[PDB]
């Protein structure tokens, strides 16, 4: 379990997924690997886009440590993966919507790095802001919520 | 590695109307999707249109010059799928194929909405008109 | 006709071609590759930017750049000759798709 209850928790929680979203997810991040690396830490997207997601919710992790996890582009290399974007995306034009945008982000190193070392408010802060001020995104749930470091 | 089976061609005089159908096997047809192509006789593959699945809600695309003469549904429970044609044409006679399609998409390099493949293709149904 | 595509080309048997798509859709997105033979389905043989399909030979793929794809047709054998086929967007960032014209590869 690298990330998949920490951060699957809200979405079930708050209804935005089925109660048996992480495990559905795990099966397709096998199939589908989640990491990616950036030219500074890894940046990992684990999604499905099956109909057991109920609304759409982005549910983002801070690690303490990166995790080590194949790579997005079909590689054996682990990723040291910092930070993962849990998309709870219902289909395939919104997740592309999101993917852009995050890549947006992923290119963005000085947010990166302050990223890293951001509270969960500040967290939230930026993030919200990224996500209601890009023109594309418009219906995203996004909350503090939402937001979480996660320990180890 | 999958069977995608087109059936219901046939001869429809100009203004009339008929509906095509295809079964499929060995894939999950829940969240397939699914495409229609056509080619007339000494012409190339026309893009009918897509059928998308339950996580979207069976929106279904079309190529504008079909659009408003053609609808597209499918049953899940028995792996098959419909579309009905009406106001045909001359130019609407050709080979009918259906598709299991996938999706693609280069988190460095593309642009949404990403792009798309047919990965399975049938044999095709045969509509001829007049 | 969103994507442009050549009538045909004569391959010598063993040597290397390539087939070219065109339109403004190709600058933002990749087009898909077929090959089709009369009497049979069409077979997938190169989609994205560098994705070779299983069930196909390894003999050659495809690439893009600008506002142009292509697939290299490389060692042509006689079972190679077969009509061409590319597809992608209609228009960029749209969802709708197209293909073109449809090239005969004809292998001596």
């Known amino acids: 379990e690298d990330i998949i209850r920490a951060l699957a928790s809200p979405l079930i929680k708050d209804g935005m997924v089925d109660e048996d979203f992480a495990e559905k997810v795990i099966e397709n991040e096998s199939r589908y690997p989640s990491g990616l690396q950036a030219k500074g830490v890894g940046f990992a997207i684990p999604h499905v886009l099956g109909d057991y997601v109920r609304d759409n919710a982005i549910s983002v992790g801070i690690l303490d440590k990166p995790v080590n996890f194949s790579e997005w582009y079909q590689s054996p290399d682990p990723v040291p993966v910092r930070v993962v974007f849990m998309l709870a995306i219902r289909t395939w034009d919104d997740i592309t919507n999101v993917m852009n945008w995050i890549k947006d982000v992923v290119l963005d190193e000085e947010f990166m790095k302050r990223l890293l070392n951001m509270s969960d408010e500040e967290i939230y802060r930026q993030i919200y802001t990224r996500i209601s001020k890009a023109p594309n995104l418009s219906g995203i749930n996004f909350s503090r919520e939402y937001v979480r470091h996660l320990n180890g | 590695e999958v069977q995608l089976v087109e059936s219901g061609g046939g001869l429809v005089k100009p203004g009339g109307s008929l509906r095509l159908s295809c079964s499929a096997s060995?894939?999950?047809?829940?969240?397939?999707?699914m495409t229609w192509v056509r080619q007339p006789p000494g012409k190339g593959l026309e893009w009918v249109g897509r059928?998308?699945?339950?996580?979207?809600?069976?929106?279904?695309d079309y190529a504008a010059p079909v659009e408003g003469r053609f609808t597209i549904s499918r049953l899940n429970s028995i792996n098959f799928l419909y579309l009905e044609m009406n106001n045909l044409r001359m130019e609407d006679s050709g080979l009918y194929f259906c598709?299991?399609?996938?999706?693609?998409?280069?988190?460095?390099?593309?642009?949404?909405?990403?792009?798309?493949?047919?990965?399975?293709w049938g044999r095709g149904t045969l509509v001829t008109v007049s | 006709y969103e994507l442009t595509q050549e009538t045909g080309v004569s391959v010598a048997l063993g040597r290397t071609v390539t087939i070219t798509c065109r339109g403004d859709?190709?600058?933002?997105?990749?087009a898909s590759w077929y090959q089709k033979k009369p009497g049979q389905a069409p077979i997938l043989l190169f989609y994205?930017?560098?994705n070779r399909p299983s069930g196909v030979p390894d003999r050659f793929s495809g690439s893009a750049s600008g506002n142009r794809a292509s697939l290299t047709i490389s060692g042509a054998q006689a079972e190679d000759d077969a009509e061409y086929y590319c597809?992608?967007?209609?228009?960029?960032?749209?969802?709708?798709?197209?293909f073109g014209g449809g090239t005969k590869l004809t292998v001596l």
């Open positions: 597809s992608s967007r209609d228009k960029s960032g749209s969802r709708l798709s197209v």
């Open positions: 598709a299991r399609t996938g999706k693609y998409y280069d988190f460095w390099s593309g642009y949404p909405p990403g792009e798309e493949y047919f990965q399975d």
């Open positions: 059928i998308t699945g339950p996580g979207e809600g069976w929106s279904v």
């Open positions: 060995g894939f999950d047809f829940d969240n397939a999707w």
């Open positions: 859709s190709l600058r933002s997105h990749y």
């Open positions: 994205g930017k560098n």
